[PDB]
């Protein structure tokens, strides 16, 4: 097979690795390439806060819950490994804060040590009356992309700077199988009105004393439209906006203020933190992830496309389960052609 | 009333602040001075790992448990304050690891969210079979001393870099009350054969990805003679030796190795951590803290000494309850003098 993966964000690179690992040994002429028009540090993935945590409500497609779980167990299994930090991975503990009682999240047993906050814990965060504590994992987008591209490179997977104009051009360039991991821009290659940009702005800050994630929720204003603080490997991400439908890629002043003042209110020690950068990214928001096979005809030959996009504000959290599912669908492509695992 | 506090480590400065904050308003004149022969960054306190956690067995003296508790409640209540990190203070969560089941510690309800580790959690730590999780606080010795000295200075408490040769000399120089916070060197001013150095060596490392404390225990080799990892504000402290009776203030090779290999085995990501410094300090080990009043008699008057030393490897953990108790004893002194 000639396989072209389109996209070098978390979804693209994880999928490319997962396919290569699973099928290199049984399919000798396996030729896997990555095409993309943005690589680290210039992908949405690089701008991600870095935390493993699904949305608070159950997803429309319950398969997503398994993909999240598989991703956690996968990442957890590297803790104890000498290279966990080089992969962008380290354990972190933290708080989820609410202005009123809410049900437990579906993921409460996936994380480690989930429990309700006690009154003394609530005293640390005055504006809030209810919440959770748990241990989870940091997965830093930037570092993980760098790890994946090294792992891919060693396995002979080749990377190409290419702005793909259509699936047609890639098929006629020889690809038997196209894996579509184009994130929020997938609509360019095939219209998909269910896919919308989730505009998130963040402030990165030097405040190494903060060891815990702190995520506040506002049930009325929707997910991640409430202050959040996430310690990274070297810096801390401050957030608080996540606006669907907004394609403006420039930082604005009003969101900066919302983030800074919301987070300084949550964590007043931030007064002494040095601003290191400010960024805006677009979460690929969709009612559910698109992860499915599609057959396209160009001339007399069929081309196989597998889509993997629309992971909203949880791409890091879910990526590995999705990569595994794409590999499963790839297996079926092979078996449809009398090829064997 | 001239009060000379001897010592500028955590014990000395906390005590001086507590006395001054308690009596400045009601006693004129009150003159509080600090004498010491080392200030930050040169005290044992500056070398401390930074974590709030008492020893695993309860203390002989039941007052010590309360002092620990008062210290936790004091420090916790600064979380929310804009200056907590400038004080050297931040919350941390972490793991206490054992090769076998042990009883719960007496302090289990003082910390936040104490529980046993689950089977899943234990897999993260291949070498260990049982443990605890809880949330506590980092109190960085260095930063806390800088904070206390600023708070003291602003309130007009004066410092003097001075080696005290005897209590007598300080009394004769005009002190009505001496607070003895000389840590492991208290024996120089008054022999105390119960007081021994607890020699601890540590390695400081840049490994900012480590967000949790990890403390292992070896029931066979004694407290803190087993690998420990404690994230500080800017650096991580790696430890694993604590020998009573050893007065060598120089780093040695064996302890470096014990610490590095123990901790690299616990936390193999340490392979990429840059060494920042290696240090040795002396914990003031005593069967129990000495915190008591004593009357001395030189010249034409009595001078009151209040001792506050012998806090072993838990001086940061216990300091504030001790400072409070000394301020109380000071109150008694004042009333006996009809102030
Ligand atoms: C501020 C913010 C914080 C977030 N924090 C988190 C978090 O803490 N945890 C979490 O799980 N998720 C988080 N997310 C969610 C989100 O899913 C991730 O950011 C994720 O990066 C999306 O992955 P992706 O690979 O599909 O897209 P991207 O990372 O955007 O990568 C897409 C790739 O496709 C390429 N591409 C697209 N179109 C073409 C074309 N026509 N030709 C060639 N190449 C093309 C791009 O160049 C790029 O290489 C966050 C999102 C935002 C905005
Ligand atoms: C490696 C290590 C790690 C530790 N980690 C922790 C931890 O994580 N948590 C915790 O709670 N505890 C910890 N401890 C214990 C803690 O460091 C000590 O209990 C504490 O610092 C002792 O405080 P101190 O003020 O009594 O002594 P010091 O900080 O040693 O202060 C002694 C002071 O007295 C002065 N002085 C002495 N004699 C004279 C004299 N004759 N004239 C003038 N000045 C004099 C000195 O100059 C100095 O100012 C640790 C100890 C060590 C060695
Ligand atoms: C951390 C959380 N996944 C997030 C999502 C969108 C924008 C900011 C933060
Ligand atoms: C963390 C603990 N208090 C400790 C004591 C002595 C040496 C290292 C660590």
From Swiss-Prot, chain A:
Sequence positions that bind FAD: 8-11, 37-38, 43-45, 49-51, 163-164, 182, 283, 312-313, 315-317
Q: How is its activity regulated?
A: Inhibited by benzoate, sodium benzoate, thiolactomycin, and hydrogen peroxide. Inhibited by 6-chloro-1,2-benzisoxazol-3(2H)-one (CBIO) and benzo[d]isoxazol-3-ol (BIO). Malonate and meso-tartrate has no effect on activity.
Q: Does the keyword GTP-binding apply?
A: no
Which terms are listed as keywords in the entry? Cell projection, Cytoplasm, FAD, Flavoprotein, Oxidoreductase, Peroxisome, Phosphoprotein, S-nitrosylation, Secreted, Synapse
Please state where this protein is localized: Peroxisome matrix; Cytoplasm, Cytosol; Presynaptic active zone; Secreted
Region Active site lid that may open upon substrate/product migration in and out of the active site and close to increase the hydrophobicity of the active site, to make the hydride transfer reaction more efficient, residue ranges: 216-228
Binding site residues for D-dopa: 53, 283, 313
The record's catalysed reaction(s) read:
a D-alpha-amino acid + O2 + H2O = a 2-oxocarboxylate + H2O2 + NH4(+); D-alanine + O2 + H2O = pyruvate + H2O2 + NH4(+); D-cysteine + O2 + H2O = 2-oxo-3-sulfanylpropanoate + H2O2 + NH4(+); D-dopa + O2 + H2O = 3-(3,4-dihydroxyphenyl)pyruvate + H2O2 + NH4(+)
Family note: Belongs to the DAMOX/DASOX family.
Protein name as annotated: D-amino-acid oxidase
Query: What is the species of this protein?
Result: Sus scrofa
């Amino acid at each position: 097979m000639r396989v072209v993966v389109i996209g070098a964000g978390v979804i693209g690179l994880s999928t490319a690795l997962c396919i290569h690992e699973r099928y290199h040994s049984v399919l000798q002429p396996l030729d896997v390439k990555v095409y993309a028009d943005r690589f680290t540090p210039f992908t949405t993935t690089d701008v991600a806060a870095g935390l493993w945590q699904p949305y608070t409500s159950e997803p429309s497609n319950p398969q997503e819950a398994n993909w999240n779980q598989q991703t956690f167990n996968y990442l957890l299994s590297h803790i104890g490994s000498p290279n966990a930090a080089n992969m962008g991975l380290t354990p972190v503990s933290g708080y989820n804060l609410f202005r009123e009682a809410v049900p437990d999240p579906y993921w409460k047993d996936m994380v480690l040590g989930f429990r309700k906050l006690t009154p003394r814990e609530l005293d640390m965060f005055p504006d809030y009356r209810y919440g959770w504590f748990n241990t989870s994992l940091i997965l830093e987008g930037r570092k993980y992309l760098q790890w994946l591209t090294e792992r891919l490179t060693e396995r002979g997977v080749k990377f190409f700077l290419r702005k793909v104009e259509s699936f047609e051009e890639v098929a006629r360039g020889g690809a038997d199988v196209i894996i579509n991991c184009t994130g929020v821009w997938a609509g360019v290659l095939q219209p998909d009105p269910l896919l919308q940009p989730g505009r998130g702005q963040i402030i990165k800050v030097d405040a190494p004393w903060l060891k815990n994630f702190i995520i506040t929720h506002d049930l009325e204003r929707g997910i991640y439209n409430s202050p959040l603080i996430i310690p990274g490997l070297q810096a801390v991400t401050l957030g608080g906006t996540f606006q669907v439908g907004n394609w403006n890629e420039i930082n604005n002043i009003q969101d900066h203020n919302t983030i800074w003042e919301g987070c300084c209110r949550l964590e007043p020690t931030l007064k002494d933190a040095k601003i290191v950068g400010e960024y805006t990214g677009f979460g690929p928001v969709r009612p559910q992830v698109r992860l499915e096979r599609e057959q396209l005809r160009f001339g007399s030959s069929n081309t196989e496309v597998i889509h993997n996009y629309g992971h909203g504000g949880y791409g890091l959290t879910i990526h590995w389960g999705c990569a595994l599912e794409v590999a499963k669908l790839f297996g079926k492509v092979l078996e449809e052609r009398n090829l064997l695992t």
